Amino acid sequence: DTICIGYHANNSTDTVDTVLEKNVTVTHSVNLLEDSHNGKLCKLKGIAPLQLGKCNIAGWLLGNPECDLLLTASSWSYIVETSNSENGTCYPGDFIDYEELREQLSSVSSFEKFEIFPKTSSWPNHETTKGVTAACSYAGASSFYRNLLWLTKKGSSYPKLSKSYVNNKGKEVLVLWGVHHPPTGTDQQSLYQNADAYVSVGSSKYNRRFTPEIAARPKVRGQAGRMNYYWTLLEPGDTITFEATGNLIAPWYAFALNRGSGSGIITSDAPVHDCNTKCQTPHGAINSSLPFQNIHPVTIGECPKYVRSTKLRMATGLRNIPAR
Amino acid sequence: DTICIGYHANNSTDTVDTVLEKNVTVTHSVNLLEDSHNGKLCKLKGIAPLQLGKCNIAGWLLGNPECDLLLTASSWSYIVETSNSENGTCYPGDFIDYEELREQLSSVSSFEKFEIFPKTSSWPNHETTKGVTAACSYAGASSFYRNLLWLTKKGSSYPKLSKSYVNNKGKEVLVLWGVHHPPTGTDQQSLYQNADAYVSVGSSKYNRRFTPEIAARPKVRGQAGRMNYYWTLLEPGDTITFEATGNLIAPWYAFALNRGSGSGIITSDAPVHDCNTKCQTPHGAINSSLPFQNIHPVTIGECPKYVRSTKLRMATGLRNIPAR
Amino acid sequence: DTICIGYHANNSTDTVDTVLEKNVTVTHSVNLLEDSHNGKLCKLKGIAPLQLGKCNIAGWLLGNPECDLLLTASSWSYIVETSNSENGTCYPGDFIDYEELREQLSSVSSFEKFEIFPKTSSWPNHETTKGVTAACSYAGASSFYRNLLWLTKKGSSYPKLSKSYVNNKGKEVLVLWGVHHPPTGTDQQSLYQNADAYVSVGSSKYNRRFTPEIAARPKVRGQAGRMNYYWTLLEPGDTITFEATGNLIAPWYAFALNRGSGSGIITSDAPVHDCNTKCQTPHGAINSSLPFQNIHPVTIGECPKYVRSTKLRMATGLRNIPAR
Amino acid sequence: GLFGAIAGFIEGGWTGMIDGWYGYHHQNEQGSGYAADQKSTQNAIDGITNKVNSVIEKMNTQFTAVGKEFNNLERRIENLNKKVDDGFLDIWTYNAELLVLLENERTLDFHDSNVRNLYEKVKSQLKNNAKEIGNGCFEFYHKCDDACMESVRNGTYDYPKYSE
Amino acid sequence: GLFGAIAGFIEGGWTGMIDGWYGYHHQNEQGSGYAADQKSTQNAIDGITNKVNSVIEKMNTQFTAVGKEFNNLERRIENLNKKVDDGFLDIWTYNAELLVLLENERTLDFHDSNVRNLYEKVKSQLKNNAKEIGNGCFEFYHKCDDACMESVRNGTYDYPKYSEESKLNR
Amino acid sequence: GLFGAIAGFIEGGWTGMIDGWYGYHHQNEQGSGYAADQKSTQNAIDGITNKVNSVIEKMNTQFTAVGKEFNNLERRIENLNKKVDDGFLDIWTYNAELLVLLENERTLDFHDSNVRNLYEKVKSQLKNNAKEIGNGCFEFYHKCDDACMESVRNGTYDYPKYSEE
């Protein structure tokens, strides 16, 4: 009669590492590292992401002709640019505080586009047509931004213009506009008609006075002239007043914004699909409850802490010794 | 005859947590987490903090009429804003590099206020009165900043002004001025008699030209006009020059700064009391030598490392097993 | 007959620390903390660092008369400023985005200096001489930067000048220029001849127009006027155009840049020697494979992780007990 | 092993027993078989389960984390931002790996200890009524049946014995 | 217990022993009583004290730590700053808690080890002259008075001075 | 010790044994001498050598790490940047020291455990044929020769016995 004390074993081939010894076969163990994604960009809370396509934030918000599919967009879970998002600012020039504007869009869940200054009723004393360019061509013909209006002189006359807008939308109104800088003094007259023009813009927290920087520059997209893009969030109840004697790319359409955390902008070439997830990465979605993942640093939703590790297996059972 | 070996026990109910087991009652333990404060804002090194009250740094430094109690402030341990510090810039406009200025004030322990350009002796050729506004009202009547002086034309005449100051204080001087931007050319003339004005300001390390940005804007505190506020630290023995053909809100009073690390600005609604402490937080003071505290991230003086933990009790004695 | 189980012991006096006990003599231990340097500034990958000496980045790039030794410089492993690097901008003024330019020279392994606008063929209608100053004196005589050219009026005439350069270097070209700001309208005339002058610069991504800011300022190095320095990185194939009716300090020499990570700028007073290392610090070089070092935070090459530790000796052997 | 039981004075484990972590063999006149100890395997499971959950709680998950853009004159701010991201990534990667390595060491030694502690709970229950062979095996002196065996793996022996 | 001593083969603790962490209780013909072991209780105190002081030294204090303001066009810079604060708070909260959890384990297993080592130091002093009962108790074979008791909790037993044990051994 | 072997029931170490970490004495009718245990000493060396290498792998080296310049209106950015560098320095200095302190405790306890496990591998090999004196010493009952000794420090005893009460 005997009795022996011993321990468990099995066919498990799971190896873990310790500080003293590597590749130690154990009987049980949990994996802490998620490394399997979806390969697909999915919805979040049932709401689909916004594909920009061959367009970037600038193009979309400005109304670049190549970005007409996006005119419909009103709500999104997150915004997605790609490797080919190059259609942004078709007329050469600076987009002042562009990176900052993007940072703002990051906390926007949706907006309500609207005509802030109706093109066919806001400018009785100025040329509302003729404001097109080969740089912004559409369908083979010269065109322009869909959300902006390039004003010009009405038969050799450009009377000072004043035009205000009061915010009654009960939210922030994103107002964009531009100031044109001709190459020569000749073009300045042909366009505006006043050689010494100016553009002034004022709200409760915004006050700035732009003046034409006439100069000769290398042609970019066939333009020696430049166009500088500006913006501002108009607060609920606040007025914004435009004054100009020329060079004004007036706002046509605006955006009444809706805030919402948990949003953001990613760059991905992965395809969008009709699926739902609580975690999104540039490579794909993640359906897991593991503490870690080595897929991607960039994340949207509730995700596991990103880590460089290749393997994070922690032991739960004992050292495995079948000794058959 | 016999002899047994055993271990200590007592009525102690202190529990601690380990990795394998929770709520483990032990005989002895030390608490590493400080969670008790003072409820009061106290002195530091015997020096009381500076109460801004319904004023903020801007109001205090410019000399906003509502901030007259601070005119006596000379030395402080740390600066305190409240939830009602809304009295700063009373004439609407931008305070250029205001956040940076606050960053500077954080390492300032005290200063000596002084009259850099005496009102009734510096400007023989300009109007030194009349520089008042309803926006900066005081005692039911129109007034203006105490440390600033709004120069206007002297009877339809605004001669070019030039005024320099040399820093003989053996410290750095904080100089503040302003530039006024009227709503209309009519006002520009009424105020400056000089439709094409400029403001130039330069020391050994500062040089910047300001120009009137006349324009129509929404009224803020009944003002379609705007006022930008500027500042500079004048190094010991350095000169600062002011030239203007209009629009200059001239410096009246400056400040000779005294540097001192270990100071800062906090936001708190807790009351000031005649007590001392080596550690101050927005919630209150802390008299402790513990390595940690979960009271607040914002700290002044020598304080325990802040952490989110609710409990941090480490075991010193052994398991407690009375087994009565 | 007997047999005993025991352990090793030796004369080793190495001590280590544990959490329960300090200064515990052991038999064997490894040192993890490197604390021995070279006291010398050495080559990296066989290439020598660039000594700036009494000159800083600005002095070197502009061509301060005191930095003539650096004219030859073409390639470097890293850049070295000293405690006496004071010679940079010899004429008083601002170096726009200097800190950013420094950040750009950090990732530059070498460049090819070339004559972008040959002094003796580019300016047929302007005075290419006479553009010297006592502030920038060399050899007891008034001089000027080696890489810039001070254009002045040619006998009471300063015709509009236009001058472009197309980048054929298949690399980035760093172009520096300056804009002069005289003290009085008189000097403006003596120098340029046009009271209302301007300087315009335009490339594919750079557009900016400069106007003379005439005013009286505190004399620096004898100068009451100012001179602002600008720079831009001209992309391969892009063109840069200079237009002016005065006040232009035109580029003379430019730089064809060769990028290359792993480089940088350091402040050291340690001498340069003909040696080679894989790790460099301000204090000197390091030949070590330890994971840590307490010499210096600033590092160039492949170095041990910097730590504030004074001692990091890890135990390998057992507790040493000779008990003689 | 740290406690010299597993892979020690008990050279191997038993692929047989599949109802627990630790247990007994017992070869009787009525037959053989395997039997796992409820007492000790339960405590071990409650413990390991708890160690894992503790580690997971400490590692707070990661919400929305996107990148920022910088223009060409913001290269210092861009590199600062980059130094922060790579910085925290270095630290969390190091913590995560370092923690596992350490707790795995703690975990295997935890088992080793448990086997050891069980063997000596039995040894201090039998004493004279059995001798220690080698591989953690006790040879009975007083012949123990199936009813008697279950008293040992129960913590309730009775010690009525003889020769020897 | 990791060493099976505390809450192990010695099931309970003694509320009666109040002068130390580990000790003995003898029962004599002269009477009973408790007595703590200086040697082993002092070494534990020194070690634990040391452990705590080691912990505190590594967690250096916090000097003046105030927040920064940003304007409406420095939202990226404000969020970078916010990311760094929350970033460091996450790590330091982690370390502080994780460190205590680990060291609490190490500490309790430390006491366990101490009790075990004491018990086995006595067992190796007595050998034949006494028999192991169970709950860390030794029953004498040679009748040990108060004088002899102190010699054991002194590390100076005189074994060969006893073969009266051999007698009572049967 | 945590296992009470080193500096414990074996009060001291042998300066005489120079070919290993753990070993035997053995005093015979043929002579004395020392002898280190290959089996257990090698396993330790492999274990420790592995512990050290694991620490080094984890502490990734430091590439070009230079500082940045900021102008007088970039104090918030300069301090932010300074807060980051000192922040990371604090953490790594902490991890570095804290790691050594902990592992050193684990290493000394490792050796302790090893000596203990060896002693008791011998003890369970001999049983009756010898008696435990004190300082980790076994006194033989059946007189063992140099040829017999090498059978014990080999894990291959044979237990031919009789005793001597």
Ligand SMILES: *[C@@H]1O[C@H](CO)[C@@H](O[C@@H]2O[C@H](CO)[C@@H](O)[C@H](O)[C@H]2NC(C)=O)[C@H](O)[C@H]1NC(C)=O
């Ligand atoms: C929309 O984006 C495309 C892609 O960048 C632009 O196409 C480029 O136009 C330039 C300017 O003439 C050409 O030199 C390139 O060769 C074109 N690239 C490709 C891939 O076609 C296009 O011009 C953009 N259109 C608008 C209105 O922005």
Ligand SMILES: *[C@@H]1O[C@H](CO)[C@@H](O[C@@H]2O[C@H](CO)[C@@H](O)[C@H](O)[C@H]2NC(C)=O)[C@H](O)[C@H]1NC(C)=O
């Ligand atoms: C000082 O601050 C108070 C409180 O904000 C200001 O009072 C407000 O003024 C605005 C504009 O006139 C009113 O719309 C609010 O109703 C007022 N609030 C309160 C609580 O009174 C006050 O105008 C400021 N005064 C100065 C001189 O700066």
Ligand SMILES: *[C@@H]1O[C@H](CO)[C@@H](O[C@@H]2O[C@H](CO)[C@@H](O)[C@H](O)[C@H]2NC(C)=O)[C@H](O)[C@H]1NC(C)=O
């Ligand atoms: C180069 O730098 C040196 C050091 O700053 C300059 O020398 C000083 O110039 C200042 C200002 O004129 C004088 O007050 C000091 O007396 C000078 N010190 C020394 C040691 O000479 C020098 O003027 C600079 N030269 C150039 C061309 O920039």
